[PDB]
Design a protein around this ligand. Structure first.
Ligand SMILES: O=c1[nH]cc(CN2C[C@H](COP(=O)(O)O)[C@@H](O)C2)cc1CO
Ligand SMILES: O=c1[nH]cc(CN2C[C@H](COP(=O)(O)O)[C@@H](O)C2)cc1CO
Lengths: 125, 123
């Protein structure tokens, strides 16, 4: 069973918090979600988990410095990465996330919110 | 004269675009300011590897700015982040918590003083 790291906006805004809870609930079916002192403790503890993770899953619809930073560190750690983006939000996903995808180790999937459990099923089965 | 890489929100929102222009204008006094989205990512990743200092205005939340800062840390780059409390926001723990006060600095500042702050950092 893989160790999993979930990323989603917090101080960038909690608009998608209920969706994040759905994603984490589904990820727990497959493995251990590691992400579930001030800000330094948060950074250091999360960097520890990010190196431990087998897969990094990020919901990248809501813009967030912390999510982007986690993804940048994860790429440099050579982590397998799954990013999930909702075009129906009306946003354009950052070129630094869209353009980081190599289609294998770093995947970016566009999706509709109702399908997120099914999409995670497809990725983790 | 350093090679300088500037970061500021675009697709996260262009609210601070005028301020970014002021920062880049002042940075040029101190050094060189360096398909599809893949070309942008690859181009900018090359510049960021070529940089001596990465300067980021981190007030507007942005995936791309955060990603640039994460890649910059792993590229062992010198980093200066600039945050405005007048925005009313609480800056990301990942940026505030990455700071070490030396090679990764996070400064709170008021918009009117950004040129003086840059003058101080770049001597
Ligand atoms: O309270 C927190 N708990 C845990 C974290 C670590 N990551 C960052 C990212 C949100 O980044 P952001 O939107 O907050 O910038 C999430 O994936 C969790 C950050 C904070 C506050 O930053
Ligand atoms: O058009 C572009 N030109 C150049 C870039 C590279 N960086 C990312 C960051 C903004 O990131 P973001 O807010 O767009 O996510 C800026 O520092 C420039 C990204 C885009 C569109 O993403």
């Amino acid at each position: 069973r893989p160790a999993l790291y979930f990323c989603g906006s917090i101080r960038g805004g909690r608009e998608d918090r209920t969706l994040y809870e759905r994603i984490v609930s589904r990820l727990r079916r497959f493995g251990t979600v590691l992400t579930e002192g001030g800000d330094r403790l948060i950074h250091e503890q999360d960097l520890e988990w990010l190196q431990q993770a087998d897969v990094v899953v990020a919901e990248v619809t809501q813009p967030s410095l912390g999510v982007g930073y986690e993804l940048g560190r994860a790429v440099a750690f050579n982590k397998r990465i799954l990013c999930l983006f909702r075009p129906q939000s009306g946003r354009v996903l950052s070129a630094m996330i869209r353009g980081a995808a190599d289609g294998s180790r770093f995947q970016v999937w566009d999706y509709e919110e109702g399908e997120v459990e099914a999409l995670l099923d497809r990725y983790f089965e």
